[PDB]
Amino acid sequence: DDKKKGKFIVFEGLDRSGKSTQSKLLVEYLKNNNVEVKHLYFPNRETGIGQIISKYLKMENSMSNETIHLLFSANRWEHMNEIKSLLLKGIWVVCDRYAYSGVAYSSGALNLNKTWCMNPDQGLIKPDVVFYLNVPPNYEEIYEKVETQKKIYETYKHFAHEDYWINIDATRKIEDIHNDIVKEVTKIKVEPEEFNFLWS
Template sequence: MINSYLTKQSEADDAAMHLLFSANRWEKRAAMLERLNSGTTLIVDRYAHSGVAFTAAKGLPGLDTAWCRAPDVGLPAPDTVFFLDLSPEQAAERGGYGQERYETTDLQKKVRQAFGTLQDPSWVVVDAARSVETVQAEIAEESERILSRCEAGVPLGTLWPSA
């Protein structure tokens, strides 16, 4: 259902899809916590921030940022969010652009702006217009710094505790 929704193969209510993605994160919460508490590092692509940005960017009545964040309040918070920043125009130059439902220049501009409103000190904004090697090196360097900080005993937080 989720994959066919993302690839334009089916239609679904935007609020329902947002809640479905959140439900999937809650379903995995216990397993994530177990792994984190055992010392495993998790790398998660398109976590809650992505859902908030994409749903809120649609500008639909009632689906503002506060509403979009609410279903994920209390989930484990990432120690760091790597935001690979790339303009919609630059993304469109890459292969495969436009195959997913949300890969339109207008929506991508709104999504990029929505991500900007979610940024906090835990974010590392990476200029993704650079070479793959340069981006990879920056992420690797930042990851080592973050892993060292976590090994020193930084407690696990939760998403949006003040929401």
């Protein structure tokens, strides 16, 4: 009746870490293996909430640090019913960015308290695995600056030792990064299981 049957994979990483390259490669690989999979992205800029987030990111409005933080969290909550329904049926979800982005970006770029940042996402569906595309920032949107990216790299380390968190050296060839990811995916437990939730 109520078991999670599909698998839920999140990609995390700084901007231009290769997330969408790798997530598209993973989705293609799963589809070639007959697995039904939905590719989702956060923020979803299409929703009423996402359209405001979009203005914020393009600097078409300005918003206070707590206001935008909470909108990013509400934007995930408005997808929970749909993600749950997919996973309950056995459809997999590959998702570019999630609650980890919310915490790392707001604490890193906006200097918000980590616990305060985590609280609104408590209760979101927990993914089976997070692939963190690790690219030290050594080299249009509000967080674009290399100075801003360096602060976020540090804050992402908050999650580095959780057993769901898989560090991926994203400085390697694209094919080799993808092979690395496919390998970890084959380790995911096959059978249905109870849903788990952040930040358990």
